[PDB]
């Protein structure tokens, strides 16, 4: 039923536009890529307090609508629309647990949803496109915040349209 709206009260578009996920608490931090430890390239999604734009995202549904409802399964991804290099998934990766990493690959139905939580929105992962959802929150290690499942400790975002770009 429920439409996701940007910081101006305007519907979040389906892929057409890009938005900054702006932490309500961690205003400073902005999204970025990083290694968790010592693997060959940095695929793990984090909030880095030392980057104050961050890389904005695009939310996609296969449904031919030009807005996003809180009830839609989404793909979240960085980069432009054409591109599938920056597509969020949840991969097991000790020490962090269930982390958000990018692949250059994509399912038709993404595994996430955007739900209201107090001041703004949280991202929620749905194991096996099932009925129960796990909040994405943060793990502080190596001087940044790694996005990962932390049911009940969601990281809350307002969504700022990038029409700066």
């Amino acid at each position: 039923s429920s439409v996701v709206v940007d910081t101006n009260g305007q519907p979040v578009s389906n892929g057409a536009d890009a938005y900054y996920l702006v932490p309500v608490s961690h205003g400073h931090a902005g999204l970025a890529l990083a290694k968790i430890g010592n693997e060959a390239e940095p695929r793990a999604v984090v909030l880095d307090p030392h980057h104050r734009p961050g890389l904005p995202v695009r939310f996609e549904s296969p449904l031919r609508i030009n807005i996003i409802k809180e009830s839609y399964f989404l793909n979240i991804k960085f980069g432009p629309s054409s591109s599938d290099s920056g597509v969020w998934d949840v991969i097991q990766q000790d020490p962090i647990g269930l982390a958000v990493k990018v692949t250059d690959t994509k399912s038709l139905l993404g595994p996430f949803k955007v739900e209201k939580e107090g001041e703004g929105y949280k991202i929620v992962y749905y194991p096996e496109r099932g009925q129960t959802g796990l909040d994405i929150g943060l793990v502080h290690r190596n001087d940044k915040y790694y996005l990962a499942v932390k049911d009940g400790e969601p990281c809350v975002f307002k969504i700022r349209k990038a029409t700066d770009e």
Binding site: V3, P11, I65, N66, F73
Partner: protein
């Protein structure tokens, strides 16, 4: 609509526009004087619906109506399974007088025919990222139950069918949801989903297969 052109004004008079604070998000089809049919995924609590439009400005269109609707009945099987049974019936506040700019359409009884060229219409994004000023139209051909399960398993439900993925890259885009696909004068489908981006070479869009839903639509609209 990707790689269509402007529709002939008032040529698709069963077309309904779903707008939200003046901004279109979905289309519907008038299938009875009090009932617009659209995409169950297009659900809102209240609708403002344009009838008899071409440009999306009422005043600039003589014969145009902006009706309101408080009421919609999603198929009881919607999103079970996922993306399936994607249809709902919006009851209008008041029934409305057919004119020449505004007319109901019968829904198809038989199932779509592989190879059949059909017309799709709406106000959703063009090839170039921009929204069209006037209603658009394109011809897409039905593909086969097989090429549609191949392209879309394990989410293909026999309550969908696929069309387009010609060489010339004709398709539905964002904002064309719940608009019509006309085969041989009848309403055969509504705009539902497809791969993203729109207009992938050899990639058809999925359409709610309305031949499945005639007894539910009849039986609902009489009550």
């Amino acid at each position: 609509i990707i790689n269509g052109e402007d529709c002939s004004p008032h040529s698709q008079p069963w077309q309904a526009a779903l707008v939200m604070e003046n901004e279109l998000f979905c289309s519907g089809v008038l299938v009875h004087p009090q009932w617009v049919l659209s995409a169950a995924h297009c659900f809102q609590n209240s609708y403002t619906i344009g009838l008899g439009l071409h440009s999306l400005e009422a005043d600039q269109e003589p014969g145009s109506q902006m009706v309101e609707a408080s009421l919609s009945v999603r198929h009881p099987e919607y999103n079970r399974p996922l993306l399936a049974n994607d249809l709902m019936l919006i009851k209008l506040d008041e029934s409305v007088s057919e004119s020449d700019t505004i007319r109901s359409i019968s829904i198809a009884s038989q199932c779509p025919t592989a190879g059949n060229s059909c017309l799709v219409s709406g106000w959703g994004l063009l090839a170039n990222g921009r929204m069209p000023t006037v209603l658009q139209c394109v011809n897409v051909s039905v593909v086969s139950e097989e090429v549609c399960s191949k392209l879309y398993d394990p989410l293909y439900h026999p309550s969908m069918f696929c069309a387009g993925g010609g060489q010339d890259q004709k398709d539905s885009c964002n904002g064309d949801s719940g608009g019509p696909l006309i085969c041989n004068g009848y309403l055969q489908g509504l705009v539902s989903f497809g791969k993203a981006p729109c207009g992938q070479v050899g990639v058809p869009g999925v359409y709610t297969n309305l031949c499945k839903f005639t007894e539910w639509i009849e039986k609902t609209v009489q009550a």
